[model samples]
Target: TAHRFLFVSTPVGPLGSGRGGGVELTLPNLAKALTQRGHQVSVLAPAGSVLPDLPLETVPGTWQSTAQSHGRATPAEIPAESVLARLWDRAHQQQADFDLILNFAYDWLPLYLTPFFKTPVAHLISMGSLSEVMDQAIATSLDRYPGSIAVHSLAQAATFPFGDRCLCIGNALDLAAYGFNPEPEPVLGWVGRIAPEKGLEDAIQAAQQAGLPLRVWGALTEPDYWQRLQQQFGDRAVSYQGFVSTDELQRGLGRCQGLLMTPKWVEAFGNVAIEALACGLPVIAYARGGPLEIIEQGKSGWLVEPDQQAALVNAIGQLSSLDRAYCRAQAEARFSLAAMGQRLEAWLLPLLS
Candidate 1:
């Protein structure tokens, strides 16, 4: 018989948006996949989430940004303004109802409270090494209870002091939602939030260097950052396409010749990389973090050295060799939700037993 699972998503962002928040895609896909495997799954998320496929309980409160954005250590105190604490407070109250508590929140509170809860909590850490305080809390949980920590990729896992102890569980995407286009248009597509850490300006510069018009997708996270990008890249042929539905995202992405990813911080896992692959678009990403693991190196996409402008320009120039059909095949072979479900179930069944 299948066990009931509860997924506690990131308290900082809503379910539907992708601006600096990729977990919006992560939680829902996990829920849907697990539920399809005959397990009952329920998702807990912040308010204003109309996640289409899952049974989501909305918690109302203000969201706090994580320390990763500033490249600073996290503070030990739980702020009065933090809704993540409140969300965990509710999770504490109802922890016993589910068979397993899967924590998707990258906050330190849930990790600190793991030992106190009678119900076993498994953390799917989303970011790379961000804070010393957060690292201490997560390491404590890992020591107190084995099999509590899971991460998206080895690149991200390597950032932590106890990263070797973490279970590496890469992400998957819904292949049906991402329709493939064999004949891609000459435009370049860039996805992710318009925040400083995302390195949107690099993508803009690369597009200019490649002499291709760039279409940017994602929610506007920081107004000042967006303004600065506008001033810096205004001379280039760049267009801002506001955050759209998954269907719309696929349509726009499918037509693009290739997708560009430039992350100053370590990307735990680039879900949009697989999304672009599913759309038959090759990825041209910085070779620093999780994208290194996601790309098939000269097969599915290209990986340039981290933060190298000239390398990005050269990779863009060579995009013509990447096969769209092969990209779709790779996505189907590795990143289907069914494959992810089977992998996760195998890992969790032992813990449940």
Candidate 2:
């Protein structure tokens, strides 16, 4: 049965700005997949948002602060001109038009607003436990509406007190959008927001130790942190590829020998790891969070101890042993849009009933 879905995007930044991080890509991918599966989909995002094929309704207002920037006890503060509040207001006004509301924003308002709407609301919690208020908001949602939450990885869910109750649906990508490369250059690739928690410096240090140039790509969310790294490491072997479109990113990323992931926090899911896999680039990631589950261990990629520079360098040395073709094949078989659609449908249908 076909159902109508209203997806509320992240309120931290306009879509395509890269400020929303993984959720920006995740939203469009999920919407497109569901639409391909004979479902009706509509998206609500902040003004200036851009999504080529998906129907988007943009709300104009102040963007919310990223959930990660705050401490555990920090109270939720809706901006005076809050886009998050306005987005939900639109959702509430049009609640009867959709069969279900998918809240992609990792903010408190959406989770707390679930019961007030007639349409079933399912929250896709993007990050691990970051704030006590967010944790409480999710807890309250679960208390009122059982099985209403979904997370990308179990490792992410485990961070919260109500983790066992959350559904772990994982993530997927549009495989056709990425091209496989059989040949690669001698350099390493690292992609993500330039934040302290991402541990980009470690990837740089490991790449330096391994004697391979590291090509860094991502939004410079924290410019000062990046400036300090450059001052410390210099730019001799490392190059910062400014945040580019997915097409451009994949094209450049595919030319790399292997992608490096060194996250300091328990990442909910490593979208970049799978992105590398789709491009036939082997991943050398720390055995943390989603990458630990995503990598096929010594085949598609190698996982090492978190924060271990020597272990990363060792994995980089072994990249020649892995087949790039197999990496692309793994992505096609497990993380395709079709696979994700099926999993999402199974989880969503029951909630509507």
Candidate 3:
């Protein structure tokens, strides 16, 4: 049976612009993968998104900064100006139009409003226990609506107190679009949102020690933090390429000798890690969060102690030994869009039936 699916994209930032990092990739990839399988898929995201590849139903309104910047005790208050409320309200009003609503928002309103909507909502949480308020709300949602809450990686799900009860589904990317270049330039690559928690500074320090120019890419979500990083390591061989499209991103990423993954928080899943590997570039990530599950110790990439500049430098030196072809094979075998769709179908069909 061909099912109609409504995918609610991130209310945190617009899609396809790198404002939401991996989300820009996840939404479109999932939609396309499902559509290829004969199911109908429609996306709901904020204004300013220009996804030429997917059927995006853009909703207009203001967006709040990520809740990750705040403390665990920070109140999970949904602001009146937030577009998330407007987006979900729209989803609720059009409830009967779809079979299942797949939520990608890491906000409180969606999780809290899950039980109210008649249309079954599957919350694919994008991050870990960012705040105590969110954790509590999600826990309640899980209890009221069993199997409603889903996270990308097991590491991310484990952060919650009711972690065992949540569904652990890993993320995937489109392999055809991401090109591989076995002969890379003598440079390190760093891709992610330009925020303090991304640990870009650590990557810069490691690059400086390794004596390699770092090609940095992604949206400048935190201008002040980005400026500080530039001022601190401005002289240390770094090139900030701003936010770019996937085509451009793969071209840039494929030419790097190695890619750096340095998230301070528990990344629900490191989309870029797979993307880089698909491009035949080895990854050197901090041994924490979702990256832990992605990198296979010396084969695909190296995992080092978080915030340890020396370890990263050593990893960079060792990256040459890692077979680039094996890295691409790893991405194809594990993180392909087809694989993701099969897993999602297995979980969703039983629920929809």
Candidate 4:
């Protein structure tokens, strides 16, 4: 009972399964890995039925699930602590025992829950919240850790205004889950959040110019936005899988030659791009955010201008020149789960010891 600890995840958005987007998935994975280390972990997530595999249990009397259609979430409908009742109920079901309560949240939950559990707390500030450039940040001790031992040097170099512990350890994919084309197609893929920031329209426009069909996946999409883009691009719009499970996405990535990502904003990391690369599919992304850090101009993939449709089209054409081995190296070297675990345990375990 003493070795048991609680890990509760809170994402202030539509609670899609880990496959959706944003910080919703990050902390959940972190909790699971900790559980692999023999710690007790539980998640308090939003209700997003978008992914059937998501294990989010609904909070009684909570209406956050009511806003599932919008893809944008705010606590306006449900008071924060109302979630405590749900947690207490689930805890009782398992006999309620833990040594520490690791709460993954960015807002008032830690401020309130700390008093309730009063156990050793490690707040998982998901998202690039630690990145000085990322939004809705909080002050915490996590920034001090390196993102991973594989890329400890890079993680150290990437630290900014956020605390040094705000390490961004990425999620690991079951690479074998992906299908193998052996001879990958020239299909362009766009996988990740569907928000305007993701530049879904831009990817569509670029694929049209390149005369290639493109596929997109992820939840949190805008209705009017998707409708307009589909109308404009038509058949070239490819299949909109809509919040694919992690396994399906890996299979999709495997068939594609490269991923075309042109996020208008500087994403903290390119989770989709990394996934694509893991499948031996290169990534052609804008010279933005984490992409710049991963996509070597002509080696792995091209980092082009974000808004220039022609540039992205050109980039995709140029992507053919990139060797598949290099792209795979970038992912296995910097973005794997073992890379994440090594980074987390190095600092955290020693300190606890």
- Compared with the true structure, all predictions reach lDDT values of 0.82, 0.88, 0.84, 0.57
**RMSD over all Cα atoms, model 3:** 3.6
What would the per-residue lDDT of candidate 1 be over residues 231-257, giving only the tens digit for each residue? 887745678877888899999999999
Q: Higher-TM-score candidate among 2 and 3?
A: 2
Report the Cα lDDT for residue 328, model 3.
94
Best by TM-score: 2
Model 1: residues with Cα > 4 Å off, grouped in runs: 17-20, 68-74, 192-211, 219-236, 239-242, 266-269, 306-310
Compare the candidates by lDDT and give the number of the best one.
Answer: 2
Indicate the worst ten consecutive residues by lDDT in candidate 1.
65-74
The number of residue pairs in model 2 that clash at the backbone is 0
User: lDDT of candidate 4?
Assistant: 0.57
Q: Write the per-residue lDDT of candidate 3 for residues 90-168, one digit (tens) a residue.
A: 8998889999999888878888888798888888877778888788889998888887777788877887888888887
What TM value does model 2 have? 0.88
Candidates' TM-scores?
A: 0.85, 0.88, 0.84, 0.69
Candidate 2 per-residue C-alpha lDDT over 82-164 given as tens digits, one digit per residue, 9 for 90 to 100: 99999999999999999999999888889888878888999999888888888999999999888889998888899999999
What value does the lDDT take at residue 223 in candidate 2? 70
Cα shift from native, residue 146, model 3 (Å): 2.3
Residue 310 local lDDT, model 3? 89
RMSD per model, one decimal? 3.5, 3.0, 3.6, 6.5
Model 4, 283-333: lDDT tens digits are 888776767666677887888876887888888787678777767766677
